[PDB]
Amino acid sequence: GPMDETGKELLLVLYDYQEKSPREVTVKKGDILTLLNSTNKDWWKVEFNDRQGFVPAAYLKKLD
């Protein structure tokens, strides 16, 4: 509902990504994430299912 959605900028995962460090998030093509921080052009911080961490930006599409 609206409280969960306020203020959130969403992301679509374009390709599966398997984590390669403890601060990375494994995601699957089609997953919908929340964007936390896009200031690094190669790695975006995201929130997904109670995790917060990094996924490469090339794997992600902003849903706006």
XYZ file of C-alpha atoms in Angstrom:
64
model
C 0.000 0.000 0.000
C 1.004 3.647 -0.084
C 3.146 3.748 3.046
C 5.527 1.087 1.748
C 5.729 2.806 -1.665
C 6.149 6.455 -0.579
C 9.376 8.028 -1.664
C 10.699 4.795 -3.173
C 12.426 4.761 -6.510
C 12.175 1.286 -7.981
C 14.540 -0.801 -10.119
C 13.997 -3.746 -12.457
C 16.699 -6.420 -12.571
C 17.663 -7.043 -16.212
C 19.999 -10.029 -15.741
C 20.682 -12.405 -12.900
C 23.481 -11.253 -10.590
C 25.306 -13.512 -8.164
C 26.980 -11.802 -5.227
C 30.775 -11.838 -5.019
C 31.312 -10.146 -1.669
C 29.470 -9.876 1.640
C 28.086 -6.428 0.765
C 26.506 -7.527 -2.546
C 22.937 -8.683 -3.173
C 22.078 -11.733 -5.297
C 19.130 -10.924 -7.568
C 17.254 -12.579 -10.411
C 16.026 -11.184 -13.736
C 12.605 -9.636 -13.134
C 13.117 -8.815 -9.444
C 11.903 -5.362 -8.362
C 14.279 -3.537 -6.015
C 14.337 -0.180 -4.242
C 17.151 2.181 -5.203
C 19.074 3.502 -2.207
C 22.051 5.203 -3.901
C 23.173 5.729 -7.498
C 26.203 8.024 -6.950
C 28.683 5.311 -8.078
C 28.183 4.820 -11.830
C 29.205 1.138 -11.703
C 27.543 -0.064 -8.435
C 24.121 0.913 -7.070
C 23.024 0.392 -3.485
C 19.647 -1.307 -3.386
C 17.115 -2.690 -0.918
C 15.429 -6.019 -1.593
C 13.636 -8.368 0.910
C 15.253 -6.988 4.116
C 18.726 -6.782 2.455
C 20.641 -3.605 1.659
C 23.735 -3.789 -0.501
C 25.260 -3.443 -3.927
C 24.433 -4.683 -7.412
C 26.242 -3.435 -10.557
C 24.332 -0.640 -12.275
C 24.479 -2.411 -15.652
C 22.144 -5.087 -14.274
C 19.442 -2.567 -13.323
C 16.792 -0.366 -14.975
C 15.235 2.612 -13.213
C 11.419 2.366 -13.170
C 10.868 6.128 -12.314
